[PDB]
Design a protein around this ligand. Structure first.
Ligand SMILES: Nc1ncnc2c1ncn2[C@@H]1O[C@H](COP(=O)(O)OP(=O)(O)O)[C@@H](O)[C@H]1O
Lengths: 555, 557
């Protein structure tokens, strides 16, 4: 059937059951209807000394338009592990609302490997993204107001880096002039809007230890500079309290479940380019004390998500990932061997071997962190046996454990093979985890290592702006932070057409922005889209809902 | 004695709302919890109770507002709580406040002292997310307008005539006048526009006047966003936005159950502007109450010239409600302001200035009379009032033929409103109402405007600018001429001059502009300058607001 038909055919257990079965007190649960809830921060605070379960990351090979299925696999693996009688959770990211009205409206996973309720997840859910948005825009309000009231701190409005947010895809608000209409109405200036999920505030929600840490981060944010170049912060404006208060429910992870009633957290949902691409630390760390096994994931390929997962999230949280799955398809692999999307159903053993180079590299890279990999093949109905076997073999020739996953079609039952290979790994392969780089390196040094060790670049080139920008940040003492690489995702390089694995290439860093709040540095290599726009016939036009509450055109 | 408002909210033991739901005859499968102290009730409740008779309906209004405060929500809640003590099956319906104030001027409890609806913190903050949904539907439509320009402008909208602005629920002056669409041909179509505070949104007004979800959708469809180069209106229906907007409001349409400090059940739902709109809580909420209780108390923004008039002439009209009684809140202090006494010396007894400002109150009673609804005055007692002033207030209320009661509900809760409650009940038992609207829809716009201005405001007559005269002809030509009228006027006078206190005579109202709400289904004549988006003060509340590890809040109230 279809993703949505399946969600609706499903039978959901009240979430309080699940809460209780995990050893969550009824006074720590906060229902939003009988199938979603917020879990207090007190749970972690009281289980602070229990041991952490096993931490498992689901990443993948370089994205293609032919599709990977990295979420499907986190949920299916999770549903197999439940069927082997394991005490397991899954942690996932909340999607933006914006797609639902432009292009998609999509399942959190797909087939018989989703998290539910699907409707609520795609609409307002528990309002987490409304609170980010209000927190971001209050700050900007307070900025523009502070100019109006004499601008005591002597900010140069033209230097302001803090923009606005909204969780709709509105190209019209990319570049605006505000502050018009007179001396009563503010100070004219050039600014604009980004999509709310790209908010530094969303990044902070996802890297905070607790509410008081969320507040200190807020206070550290850079909104702009004085006429002399001194930086001004959210704390210079006394914004941090108000913004923390506006997030007091948002900071609590949201408990949901799979089609098969395995417990799931959904919490946070940042960008994976100008930010790190994970769900929150709060949820993953809470899941760790509530389960023996935690399955989580990260955006884009392992060159980006996984690398940041390890180098940002784990570093902050003090997590030691115990294993990592890497997803791949025979379809996707052939594209990396030059086959076009048109011809993906024609068998091509030759193309599959060449395209394998993409996967081979990721495995090596995952190697670099001392985490035991496992390849998981997403089964696809037009894949011939010759192909699959050849893949299986090539992973083994690369010394990698590999499994067939049919979790899309068959649910927890299609994940069993993979689950077993995962369990086989946890018990018998102790992880030797370490960050790829030290924080004391310079900014250029950190970018080199990643660019050379992870992307396979000969080296890195900097523009005059980027050079001047790094020289400034280091001089303000922002130089011993991590680094978050804003690159394309469709290649190891920064050339979207250079399908993996290219050699003899260099990476170029065109701009450098700062996220003092989240606590990192962002090198840009391409033009980055922080606010997408609607297509010619947006989905909104065809969405409807009748008298009986039956919805259409949403999925 | 009396603690702070927030000290009181936290000291009060709330009952799980599910109990309260059941106490009201609501089935488990009609309730949807947001924690154990908030809930959304199904619209199917009203549907299965459609044939039950209605409870009594009791409107709480007030005299002309001042800075110096009135006391209307506090009365609404205290009245409710007294009625509950007297053994009656009663509900109160109120508006959800905007988020914005909490970060500028102050967070205002929903009521005050011992007359509060709770949980306080949640109602002021995100509550059940109704205002966020209103915000997302409004701005989705606006995104859909700009996109339509970008994609070949098939409907031939002239960007420069676009009336549909955007919204956000924060007080941000810098966004009032903006230019968007800049950056090249890939980034939209440059144009002048702006933001308004989310509670001003026609979307909000539509939420508060919809019969149910399919009706709220139809309204949405009728909304006018701009005009073609030829002058033809382009509706949100024309851009097929109404289904999505409705879908974005699927939980927002359900009234939210909560309660008072004394566990009397309560609905908070909807929250519009009382000037460019009607200043009332939702019809959905009010009509459901009327099926689940023998007594329903609700209220309207601003003084009775504005809210009451709109409650009667828009809300009750659309709903088929017939108000059985109406309460008017006055204070001694404010009545002296209306007889000339400035705020600095309001504590000083002054019988002569009190006698003079009573004129304000006198005029409102008369006006309430014009709708066939028996009035009852509620004197909101304040500790510096002398007994001589109070007795002279009671005398003047009798000489003017209105029952009257002292109300000490701020200090003493339900007990402090028993005397008023009993007067209200005397009136329901003995003076059934003769409710009629003020005006027929068939009058012309200028006729309806004149009826309000002369009958209610006390005006000699009404003047128009050339712009207004163009707008009115335009609206009448397009057939929006048999609509109700929603007068955006200052609240601090009967006049449109915010300094003319009391009961001004020999005066004339002037209508500078006229906007249209096709979706909410009314015409809006503007008499002043109208602030649809306030700004923050020199030292905003946000600067002094904090929250520590123990979850303790400060500087929020
Ligand atoms: N009798 C009273 N004593 C002290 N304070 C009062 C009294 N009545 C009202 N207030 C306070 O003064 C303000 C006026 O009452 P409120 O219900 O807030 O006004 P309204 O709803 O009429 O705008 C309120 O914030 C309320 O808390």
């Amino acid at each position: 059937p279809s993703d949505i038909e399946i969600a609706q055919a499903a039978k959901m257990k009240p979430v309080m059951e699940l809460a209780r079965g995990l050893g969550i007190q009824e006074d720590e649960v906060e229902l939003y209807g009988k199938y979603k809830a917020k879990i207090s921060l007190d749970v972690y605070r009281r289980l602070k000394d229990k041991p952490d379960g096993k931490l498992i990351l689901v990443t993948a090979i370089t994205p293609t338009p032919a599709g990977e299925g990295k979420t499907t696999t986190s949920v299916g693996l999770t549903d197999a592990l439940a069927r082997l009688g394991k005490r397991v959770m899954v942690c996932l990211r909340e999607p933006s609302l914006g797609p639902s009205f432009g292009i998609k409206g999509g399942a959190a996973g797909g087939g018989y490997a989703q998290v539910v309720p699907m409707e609520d997840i795609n609409l307002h859910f528990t309002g987490d993204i409304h609170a980010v948005t209000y927190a971001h825009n209050l700050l900007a309000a307070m900025v523009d107001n502070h100019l109006q009231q004499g601008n005591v701190l002597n900010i140069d409005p033209r230097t302001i880096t803090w923009r606005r947010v909204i969780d709709l895809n509105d190209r019209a608000l990319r570049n605006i002039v505000i502050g018009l209409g007179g001396k009563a109405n503010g100070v004219p200036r050039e600014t604009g809007f980004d999509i709310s999920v790209a908010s530094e505030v969303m990044a902070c929600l996802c890297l905070a230890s607790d509410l008081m840490d969320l507040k200190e981060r807020f206070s550290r944010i850079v909104v702009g500079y004085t006429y002399d170049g001194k930086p001004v912060t959210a704390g210079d404006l006394e914004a941090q309290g108000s913004m923390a208060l506006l997030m007091k429910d948002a900071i609590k992870p949201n408990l949901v479940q799979t089609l098969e009633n395995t417990p799931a957290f959904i919490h946070g949902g940042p960008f994976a380019n100008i930010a790190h691409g994970c769900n929150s630390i709060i949820a993953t760390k809470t899941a760790l004390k509530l389960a023996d096994y935690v399955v989580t994931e990260a955006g884009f390929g392992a060159d980006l998500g996984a690398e940041k997962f390890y180098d940002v999230k784990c570093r902050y949280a003090g997590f030691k990932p115990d294993a990592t799955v890497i997803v791949a398809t025979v379809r996707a692999l052939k594209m990396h061997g030059g086959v076009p999307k048109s011809d993906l159903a024609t068998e091509n053993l030759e193309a599959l071997r060449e395209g394998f180079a993409n996967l081979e590299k990721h495995i090596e890279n995952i190697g670099k962190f001392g985490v035991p990999a496992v390849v998981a093949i997403n089964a696809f109905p037009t894949d011939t046996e010759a192909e699959l076997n050849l893949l299986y073999e090539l992973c083994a020739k690369a010394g990698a454990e590999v499994a067939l996953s049919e979790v899309w079609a068959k649910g927890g039952e299609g994940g069993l093979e993979l689950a077993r290979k995962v369990l086989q790994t946890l018990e018998s392969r102790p992880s030797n985890f370490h960050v790829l780089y030290n924080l004391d390196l310079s900014i250029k040094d950190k970018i080199a290592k990643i660019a050379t060790e992870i992307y396979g670049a000969d080296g890195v080139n900097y523009t005059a702006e980027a050079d001047k920008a790094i020289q400034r940040y280091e001089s303000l003492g922002y130089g011993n932070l991590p680094v978050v690489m804003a690159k394309t995702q469709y290649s190891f390089s920064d050339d979207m057409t250079k399908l993996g694995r290219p050699r003899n290439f260099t990476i170029t860093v065109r701009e450098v922005r700062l996220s003092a709040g989240a606590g990192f540095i962002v090198p840009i290599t391409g033009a980055i889209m922080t606010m997408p726009g609607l297509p010619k016939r947006p989905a909104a036009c065809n969405i409807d809902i009748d008298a009986d509450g039956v919805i259409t055109g949403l999925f």
